[PDB]
Design a protein around this ligand. Structure first.
Ligand SMILES: Nc1ccn([C@@H]2O[C@H](COP(=O)(O)OP(=O)(O)OP(=O)(O)O)[C@@H](O)[C@H]2O)c(=O)n1
Ligand SMILES: [Mn+2]
Ligand SMILES: [Mn+2]
Ligand SMILES: [Mn+2]
Ligand code: NA
Length: 461
């Protein structure tokens, strides 16, 4: 990922983009009943908390493009991955404009809360103005596509969320690169069935966990993995991807019946962006707000791990590489132990910055006791060990509950934290409910007791 040029959007006919300068995150009824150190992320250049330029920080994520061509190892990675995906008989057809808009099995309907993106964002028209769940009317959309045409600029917003103090002082806020409703609809028609096949098959065949339900999936993972587990996290995964990784991706798409629209992958790779009043062009890097961002990142991840393994352990048997990825996050395994640190080294050569799984000091053996996937641990249930508990640390939950964006969604927000928390055991869960009910707001919420949740879980399989 690298920015080729950036300049005043007026110099090229683009309207300045308005983005609220004030966070929507305010302390919640539970702010002083729980401990937390995170605060809202810097949204503007003026934030008094800053200790460096906001611009130099939000964009520094584009470390550059380390590789130029797709080498032999990547090519082999491609062939093998494309091989597995082949056993899914992925319907290679296109998706009728309707389904792409209002869903179908394996794919949800478009989200009405996310930006409509350019031009609509600068014209004033929202997503409710075009779509309409009731009739599934293609017309308004179908018309708008012809008017403004696909492959449209991405609107860049700073993400309004909680972040550690350091990441606040160093201006390490995160950006949201939003695609026009058009682009998003085009892609969902182009790759719609691909998405559906992935959503319906989380596991080691797709090597993706997208669309998964942790309460059920965690019990299916251990069985899918090989004897030895290995893991690591990337730093700036999305923005570090070089153009070559997108080409490898197109090669996979080509091999499974999508050579047709591999062009779309080109816009993810070489993209046009609008942030505030400035405009820039980015070579490489996966944008965050596109249709498929999540899935395409997982496919590339499947290519990366394969590549690093082929270049570090000539003769490794990829047929016994059992991995599952969710964008940058990944959990993998092999019949034999491997050196994650060594793999990390090869990673740099491919433009990836890999470090010990879970901010550890150094690479240490990965076990079922210490491995995490999506911030969650794996813990077999006391009474029935064949059922695995996806365990989200309480700290994460404590951090989330101390803040709010809308008092109206307090019920749903806390209920959600409850569905994550109870896996930490009945004792912990009850303390959590107790503190919640130690203030007026909490006592008025309808929260499920432990027994109710644990029983529902047991019968869900
Ligand atoms: N709108 C956004 C922006 C970024 N990201 C994700 O957040 C990552 C960066 O977040 P942070 O966790 O803040 O950077 P990391 O380098 O991943 O953190 P660490 O150095 O601790 O590994 C990106 O690579 C991307 O996967 C996201 O999900 N949505
Ligand atoms: Mn990370
Ligand atoms: Mn981080
Ligand atoms: Mn991560
Ligand atoms: Na890009």
């Amino acid at each position: 990922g690298e920015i080729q040029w950036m300049r005043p959007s007026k110099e090229v006919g683009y309207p300045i983009i308005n983005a609220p300068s004030k966070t929507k995150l305010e302390p919640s009824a539970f702010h002083y009943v729980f401990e937390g150190v995170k605060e809202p992320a810097v949204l503007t250049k003026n934030d008094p908390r800053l200790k460096t330029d906001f611009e130099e920080a939000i964009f520094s994520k584009y470390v550059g493009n380390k590789i130029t061509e797709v080498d032999e190892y990547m090519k082999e990675a491609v062939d093998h991955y494309a091989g597995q995906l082949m056993s899914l008989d992925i319907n290679t057809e296109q998706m009728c404009l309707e389904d792409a808009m209002y869903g179908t099995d394996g794919l949800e309907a478009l989200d009405l809360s996310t930006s409509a993106g350019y031009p609509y964002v600068a014209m004033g028209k929202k997503k409710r103005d075009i779509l309409n769940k009731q009739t599934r009317d293609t017309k308004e959309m179908q018309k708008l596509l012809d008017t403004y045409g696909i492959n449209l600029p991405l609107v860049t917003y700073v993400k309004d969320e909680l972040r550690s103090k350091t990441k606040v002082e160093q201006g390490k806020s995160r950006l949201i690169e939003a695609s026009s409703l058009n682009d998003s609809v085009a892609m969902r028609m182009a790759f719609g069935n691909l998405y559906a096949a992935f959503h319906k098959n989380p596991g080691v065949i797709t090597g993706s966990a997208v669309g998964c339900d942790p309460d059920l999936f965690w019990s299916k993972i251990p069985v899918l993995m090989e004897e030895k587990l290995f893991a690591f996290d990337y730093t700036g995964y999305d923005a570090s991807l070089s153009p070559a990784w997108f080409e490898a991706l197109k090669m996979v798409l080509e091999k499974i019946g999508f050579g047709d629209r591999v062009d779309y992958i080109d816009y993810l790779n070489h993209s046009h962006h609008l942030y505030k009043n400035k405009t820039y062009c980015v070579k490489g890097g996966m944008p965050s707000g596109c249709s498929g961002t999540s899935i395409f990142n997982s496919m590339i991840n499947n290519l990366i791990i394969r590549t690093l393994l082929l270049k570090t352990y000539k003769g490794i048997d990829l047929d016994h590489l059992k991995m599952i990825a969710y964008g940058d996050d990944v959990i993998a395994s092999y019949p034999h132990e491997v050196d994650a640190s060594l793999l990390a080294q090869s990673g740099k050569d491919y433009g990836l910055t890999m470090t010990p799984a879970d901010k550890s000091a150094t690479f240490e053996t990965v076990t079922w006791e210490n491995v995490t996937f999506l911030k969650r641990f794996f813990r077999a249930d006391e009474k029935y060990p064949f059922l695995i508990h996806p365990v989200m640390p309480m700290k994460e939950i404590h951090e989330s509950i101390r803040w709010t964006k809308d008092p109206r969604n307090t019920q749903d927000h806390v209920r959600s934290l409850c569905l994550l928390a109870w896996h930490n055991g009945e004792e912990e869960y009850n303390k959590f409910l107790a503190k919640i009910r130690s203030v007026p707001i909490g006592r008025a919420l309808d929260l499920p007791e432990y027994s109710t949740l644990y029983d529902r879980w047991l019968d869900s399989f």
